[PDB]
From a paper:
The proline-rich antimicrobial designer peptide Api137 inhibits protein expression in bacteria by binding simultaneously to the ribosomal polypeptide exit tunnel and the release factor (RF), depleting the cellular RF pool and leading to ribosomal arrest at stop codons. Separation of cellular extracts derived from cells exposed to Api137 in a sucrose gradient reveals elevated levels of partially assembled and not fully matured precursors of the 50S subunit (pre-50S). High-resolution structures obtained by cryogenic electron microscopy demonstrate that a large proportion of pre-50S states are missing up to five proteins (uL22, bL32, uL29, bL23, and uL16) and have misfolded helices in 23S rRNA domain IV.
After an initial alignment and several rounds of variability sorting, seven ribosomal states common to both datasets were identified, i.e., 70S, 50S, and 30S ribosomal states and four pre-50S precursor states. These precursors represent late stages of 50S assembly, with most of the 23S rRNA regions stably formed, while the subunit´s so-called functional core (FC) appeared unstructured. To elucidate the underlying molecular defects leading to the accumulation of precursor particles, the most immature states from the Api137 data set (d126_(L29)-/(L22)- & C_(L22)-) and the control data set (C_L2) were compared. In the states from the control dataset, we consistently observed mature helices H61 to H67 of domain IV. Since the binding of uL2 always required the previous incorporation of uL22 and bL32, the binding of uL2 may reflect a checkpoint in late 50S assembly. The incorporation of uL22 and uL2 converts state 3 to state 10, and the incorporation of uL22 converts state 8 to state 9, allowing further maturation along the canonical route.
Numbering used by the authors:
A (entry chain 2): 1 to 46
B (entry chain C): 1 to 231, 243 to 271
Amino acid sequence: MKRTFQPSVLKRNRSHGFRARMATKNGRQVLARRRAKGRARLTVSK
Amino acid sequence: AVVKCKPTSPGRRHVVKVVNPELHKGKPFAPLLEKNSKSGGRNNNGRITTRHIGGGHKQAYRIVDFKRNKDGIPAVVERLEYDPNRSANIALVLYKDGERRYILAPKGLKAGDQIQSGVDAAIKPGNTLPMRNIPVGSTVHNVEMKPGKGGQLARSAGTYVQIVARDGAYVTLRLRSGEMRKVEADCRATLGEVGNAEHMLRVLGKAGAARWRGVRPTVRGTAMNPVDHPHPVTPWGVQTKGKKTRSNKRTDKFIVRRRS
RNA sequence: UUUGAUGUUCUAACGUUGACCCGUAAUCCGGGUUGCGGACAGUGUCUGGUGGGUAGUUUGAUCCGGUGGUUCUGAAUGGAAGGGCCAUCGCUCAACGGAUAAAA
RNA sequence: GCUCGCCGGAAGACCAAGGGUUCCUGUCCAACGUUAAUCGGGGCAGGGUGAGUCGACCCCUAAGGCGAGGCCGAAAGGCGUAGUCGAUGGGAAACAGGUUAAUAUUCCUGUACUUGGUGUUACUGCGAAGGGGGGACGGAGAAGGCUAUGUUGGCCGGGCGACGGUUGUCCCGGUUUAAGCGUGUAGGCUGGUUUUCCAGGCAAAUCCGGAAAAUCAAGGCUGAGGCGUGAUGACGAGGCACUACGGUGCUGAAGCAACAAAUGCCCUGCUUCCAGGAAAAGCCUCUAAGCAUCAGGUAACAUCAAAUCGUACCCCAAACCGACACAGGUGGUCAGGUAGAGAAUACCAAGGCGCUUGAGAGAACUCGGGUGAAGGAACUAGGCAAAAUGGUGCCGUAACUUCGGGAGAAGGCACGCUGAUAUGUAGGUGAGGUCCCUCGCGGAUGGAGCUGAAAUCAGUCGAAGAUACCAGCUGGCUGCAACUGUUUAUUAAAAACACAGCACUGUGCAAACACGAAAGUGGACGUAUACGGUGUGACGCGGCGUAAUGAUGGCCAGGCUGUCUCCACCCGAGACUCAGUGAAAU
RNA sequence: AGGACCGAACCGACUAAUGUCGAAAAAUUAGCGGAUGACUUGUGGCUGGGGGUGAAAGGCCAAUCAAACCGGGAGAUAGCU
């Protein structure tokens, strides 16, 4: 059975990319939370 | 014409086709073509607003001249074509000035006939005359409700409206629904009745006909769960089967009679 | 003379998902012209009815007090309203120590 | 290195997505490989990715997203125009051979091709977000020419050979060559030349469209393939000389005919059908504004540039998704020989592998199978499972029926091989010669040669010739449901859901209905022969019947058999012993 | 021509067996139905939680659905263990 996750760089970038996050106001808040927490990888990117 | 298919198999056993030999067996006039992207019942929000709509064979929208603003320009009807967007076939018209357009083909229109629009036009079927000029007690179609609107009434196959009285600047029209409407005289209309009157004889044979025509399966209320459907009421709680919903109070002044 | 309810007509309010022109290589939008309706429709507050479509729930007590007398008191003074004192009265509120005025 | 076996429409080769050096070499068994391992997709070091012609990049855009102004909404924010993104699509160009341990359509050898800038030469009107053509399209199906590809024959080099014969009608290996260039054929499309005029193509136009005429009847467009150049070039079986003994250098004969032939090309072709089958850009043409001694364009020549990014490796898997080196899943292309209708099936070429625990014995028992005396469903809730038929050709095929179907109903007989018909027939293809020719890829004779079913007779071997794999059990009664189809991913595939049809009701369009505080949308760029909701579900009169249909419920009959009386033997993996690694619930 | 017939790839799992601390958190073998469409699939987007979608089973919404997941109210409350 095909599993739930089917990798695709284009889909990943356009769904969870930094530009996608910044497009919406809430994504900016999510990025701010990530920066405050201090995680090295703010978002998924190559 | 009407033809009954041999019952060679299920899906042909109950098939009745409406064959029109005089239709054009070729591509439509490309310059007047335009794309028609299906919506599947979705809207701007992307949710479903109308049910039982989706799929279907791809079709191209043909621009049809309903207003008929070419006044005093005699034209020749080149041929007839099948318009997927209308239940009635369309007709290609070439004007003397050298321009081509589409019109609705009435019952008595065939290839090679002559047509003319404007007030200075004869009484032959298909001509565009104001209802003021059209004699009372006649049959017309593609009637306009406002000057220059284009025409909205009697646009389906074999549909026509009767001019029943003439009250000065307004005219009374009986529609195929039994509706008596009062319309301004300056509005334009087309003589005769729409063609392709045999549109009723088709039965579509099987599910696939409607499926590729654009209709999707309909689910009855009883089979639905209480949460999904109230189950005689509509899915949204409106009581159907004998409950009028006409509440406008704006166009009622143009209403003379109600359906009986 | 104030006039309102109603009837006919009209435009200056108002609608125009009618037409023409401009910003504009623009089905949007705004502006200028006109025609169509026009004090109708619609909108804002209030209100009568419907409204499992939706939402919160169930399966002589008590609260309210009717009347009386008593200036006991009555929030600046004098009244009045509201409270206290004594009498009586309205519910087999009987699920009768009665959990809500209001629930299958 | 030699044997045995498996895949071979894949268990082979390419890719797309997805991983990111797992690719090659040197080097070691610290940890992993369900055991050892000197080995590896493991540890460390080094090397490896070469693009004007491959793709990305870039021009345009569909679905969709963002959205200057603008509308709406307490704010957040929602919608949307001009515009901007967005390939899953449309635009320009490369092929053959060779090379490393890893790149090649990128490097080397040869032939080229495409887009723009610069300068010269001779001409000329140029000039658009504007107009016209094209780009630009569905389903199904038949034929003709082709090609990739394969068979035979001729030719070339070799062989005559360890168990009988094999200088012979014998055997082995080769018999390949691209893109570009010119001819342009088979085939398909279309009637052309000239003049005059027209409120049409939101301005104009010599461009498109329309109307008139005089002229010929041919012209024009598209178009695979073949033919010569490409190429007395590369490649080429095989032999020769050295080998760090893995391998490297020299050489190199023939390189032809016929047949069959595809899902690939002519073919976005042609014929029919309703379900009527994208958009834009590049591209050819017309002019508007402005300039026409310019500028610009055309045709030829020389030159410059064509940047940047990925270029290893896996890609039906050990490397991707499944926590695993997981019996699972992953889109497209090429995909040959024999028998075969077939990409099915059995054995093979090319190419790739023996799947990361084995060695002994052959207990009960478990798992998957083969055989079997008699009965042939007596076992079982139940023919559950097992057993049996299964293909081609000839004859024949009942009741019912909506006249289509039932039906392959059911049921009867021949299938192998050899000679003749016929030194392989009919059929298909078709050489050379000859005659014509509006003269080349042009039309007739002709059958050379190749391929080539089906059928009759006679003979012949076997217990059995559709002898292997592949490959319907059959009929009757009967309730349900029109049928096809879909559903409870992961215990219910059905009588359930859905269905074409039927009937009621609502909606007159700024329509109803629904998402939205409202804007605005689908309905519908449709409109009463249109759409929404409701109940039933073909057809004849929710009730009665209903042909066909059904992995539907039940019963019966013919064959069949290990289901059973009753199990017995045998074939493979466990179970048992030895060596190495090594959990669990509780 | 057939929402035609037998039948490969492809789709699904209707029957049987093994697998239940299996190779697989529904798998494998032979039968099985469709296999020109009411078919399937690659890619690219839209429909978002009283909401979406649903040929409709109370089915699916990333192994969780008669109301998903993540952080907070929140150390909710528990006459209960």
